[PDB]
Amino acid sequence: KQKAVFGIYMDKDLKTRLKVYCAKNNLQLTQAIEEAIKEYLQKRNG
Amino acid sequence: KQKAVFGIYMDKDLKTRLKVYCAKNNLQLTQAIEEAIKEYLQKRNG
């Protein structure tokens, strides 16, 4: 629930793929990034 | 290589966990997000 902001320069096709993912699941772009980066740390290490 | 910008409000601990991941691997925050969101789409569907 504690929030922060993030302003980065990421690739288009990749961010946009996820954008389409957010369109398909009607998800929020942010929510998807957070899920992405969340399941990424656990899939990796942290 | 085609770049875009992204400005969202994501959780702290989560984004910050990844920040520590970027500190540990000396990675770039953005590069980590992109890897995160990349491996997320493929782990999911797209």
Q: Which two tokens stand for residue B19?
A: 């920040």
Quote the number of domains for chain A: 1
> How many contacts (CB atoms, under 8 Å) link A and B?
131
Cross-chain Cβ contact A17/B45 below 8 Å: no
* Distance (Å, whole) CA A19 – CA A29: 6
Alpha-carbon distance values, B17 to A13, A40, B2, B42 (Å): 25, 11, 27, 22
**CATH code (residue A41):** 1.10.1220.10
Cross-chain Cβ contact A15/B7 below 8 Å: no
Residues 6+ apart with CB under 8 A from A26: none
* Distance (Å, whole) CA A38 – CA A31: 10
Experimental technique: NMR
Domain extent at residue A27: 1-46
Chain A contact set for B15 (CB, 8 A)? 4, 6, 34, 37
Q: Would you call A3 exposed, middle or buried from its count of C-beta atoms within 10 A (0-12, 13-18, 19+)?
A: exposed
Chain A contact set for B9 (CB, 8 A)? 3-6, 30
